[PDB]
Design a protein around this ligand. Structure first.
Ligand SMILES: O=C(O)c1cccnc1C(=O)O
Ligand code: SF4
Ligand SMILES: [Cl-]
Ligand SMILES: [Cl-]
Ligand SMILES: [Cl-]
Length: 298
């Protein structure tokens, strides 16, 4: 079926499939590498294949292209996009820089390429605290996610200016204190791993506040977990740790953009060499500096 044809074309194209943790299980199962956004960025700096098929969202594929100008990067659907990244506009960044001209600008690694050109360093949920703590300023411009910004402020003690003020990931915003209560009711011996893009009051109920990479690293600390992040992470964790139990905090917590990627459009991506991801060089050069700096700092 599609799996057999995909694998043949991957060989014919000298291609590698990189997948995010939130991809469908059947897509994770054909990927050469699976990770969070930080791990995907790092993995993109050691690509020896000629073609990268990105089972993720468009701005992640753009980050891979920024790091690999001489490789073909394919996004299987141009509708695979990130609602959180779309909330941040250049006008938000310019506005904040005029109010705080000496503050570093710290932006999520899969913001738009134009936004990343204004970043001094990029971050993800996995390294935001580590990076911001190392910056020598007590005020930081940070976005797009106001909930991650709040967590960073709490963990560093710095003043974190969120750009844009309402930016957030709708998937993580959904989680409520009622979901915490239901999780404790259903799995009283489970510990709660809660992503730092959840709202602060949900974060305060966590047994561990952790990025998805942190969820993998700290999963060894217990045998039973309820997972407050996008539901496909539960499949990823179950695959890594077949001896443990993982339960989604919400069955309906899914990223529509991530699920634009299908086995069928991965097959079509390799067959027809589409859709080719390109980033203008002036933007790419500035974004590359911020991404490479992030990788040096983490
Ligand atoms: O892997 C991440 O950093 C991540 C964490 C929460 C939500 N989304 C993402 C993403 O990359 O789309
Ligand atoms: S899960 Fe949230 S931050 Fe990650 S791609 Fe989807 S909308 Fe964007
Ligand atoms: Cl490779
Ligand atoms: Cl994460
Ligand atoms: Cl194309």
């Amino acid at each position: 079926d599609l799996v057999e044809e995909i694998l043949r074309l991957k060989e014919e194209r000298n291609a590698i499939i990189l997948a995010h943790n939130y991809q469908l299980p059947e897509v994770q199962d054909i990927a050469d590498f699976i990770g969070d956004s930080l791990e995907l960025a790092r993995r993109a700096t050691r690509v020896d294949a000629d073609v990268i098929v990105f089972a993720g969202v468009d701005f992640m594929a753009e980050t891979a292209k920024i790091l690999n100008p001489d490789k073909v990067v394919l996004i299987p659907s141009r509708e695979a996009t990130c609602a959180m990244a779309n909330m941040l506009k250049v006008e938000h960044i310019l506005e904040a820089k005029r109010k705080y001209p000496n503050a570093p600008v710290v932006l999520y690694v899969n913001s738009t390429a134009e936004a990343k050109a204004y970043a001094d360093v990029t971050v993800t949920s996995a390294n935001a605290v580590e990076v911001v703590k190392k910056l020598d300023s007590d005020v930081v411009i940070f976005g797009p996610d106001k909930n991650l910004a709040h967590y960073v402020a709490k963990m560093t003690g710095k003043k974190i200016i969120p750009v844009p003020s309402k930016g957030h990931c709708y998937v993580h915003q959904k989680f409520t204190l009622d979901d915490v209560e239901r999780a404790k009711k259903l799995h009283p011996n489970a510990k709660l791993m809660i992503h730092p893009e959840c709202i602060p009051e949900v974060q305060e109920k966590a047994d561990i506040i952790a990025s998805t990479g942190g969820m993998i690293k700290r999963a060894c600390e217990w045998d039973e977990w309820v997972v407050f992040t996008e539901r496909e992470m539960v499949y990823r964790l179950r695959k890594l740790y077949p001896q443990k139990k993982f339960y989604p905090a919400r069955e309906d917590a899914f990223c529509i953009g991530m699920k634009a990627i299908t086995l069928k459009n991965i097959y079509e991506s390799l067959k027809d060499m589409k859709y080719k991801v390109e980033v203008p060089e002036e933007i790419a050069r500035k974004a590359r500096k911020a991404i490479e700096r992030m990788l040096e700092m983490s």
